[PDB]
Amino acid sequence: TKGKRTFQPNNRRRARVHGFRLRMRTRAGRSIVSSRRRKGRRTL
Amino acid sequence: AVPKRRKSRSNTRSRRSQWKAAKTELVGVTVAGHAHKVPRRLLKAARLGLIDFD
Amino acid sequence: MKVHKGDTVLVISGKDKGAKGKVLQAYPDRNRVLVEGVNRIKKHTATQEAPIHVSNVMVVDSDGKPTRIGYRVDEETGKRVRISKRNGKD
């Protein structure tokens, strides 16, 4: 682990962990998306 | 070792005035019927057309 | 506006106060009109008129003097006709 950094990008794992269809499965995630529409974020 | 105090206006100016360019001597050149001025170490090349006067 | 394209107008304030000219073009969303002969501009090439504010001209009533202008329902078409004050014509 010499030289290895924290962020290793992978676009399929950004979507399966943080994406829209995971947020919309639990009540905690619907309250996050409803609170980012309410603040006015362009990305949810 | 960092500086302990900022220098006063007198102490920074005395050092800074000794940063100055040494000018060079200029002698006279007539090539192609034109009076120019070159430094003396370039006098042979000025007489041979090797110096561009811009 | 109450000032139209074909109308002749009298300048009542400004540098060209007193000049009679006619409107060349009207700019309603700025309240400005172009009158021929007024505030000539020495523009550098590559003199014509500049627009003045509409509150500096008055419409001339075809009997000499300028006027504030009023309206009148013509009773036979149902559209208001722009009539003059101070002896009431057109």
Partner: protein
């Protein structure tokens, strides 16, 4: 007193201290004597400083009708202009500031025997 001409050079991308090193050679000298001191000075600011003495000598001859053989650099100085700010990354996540300095250069040549 004497008939003169002014040329200014604004927003020259030369540091003002580096400009002042090369105008100390030519202060008070005549214009013919100053253009060839600045021709053979090895410093880079001697390029822009020479062109403003040259454009001051041109405005005296053209716009003033003055004799080119009688012109002298009467007044020269270098002010400063606006400074752009930059960032140089350093060790262990430090960031230092780099400054791009500019100069305003004024030349007043005057005609005198």
């Amino acid at each position: 007193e004497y008939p003169s001409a002014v040329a200014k050079a604004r927003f020259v991308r030369v540091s003002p201290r580096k400009a002042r090193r090369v105008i100390d050679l030519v202060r008070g000298r005549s214009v013919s004597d100053a253009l060839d001191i600045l021709r053979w000075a090895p410093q880079a600011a001697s390029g822009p400083v020479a062109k403003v003495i040259a454009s001051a000598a041109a405005n005296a001859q053209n716009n003033g009708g003055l004799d080119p053989a009688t012109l002298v650099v009467a007044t020269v100085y270098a002010d400063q202009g606006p400074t752009a700010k930059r960032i140089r990354p350093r060790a262990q996540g430090r960031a230092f500031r780099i400054r791009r300095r500019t100069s305003h250069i004024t030349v007043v040549v005057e005609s005198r025997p």
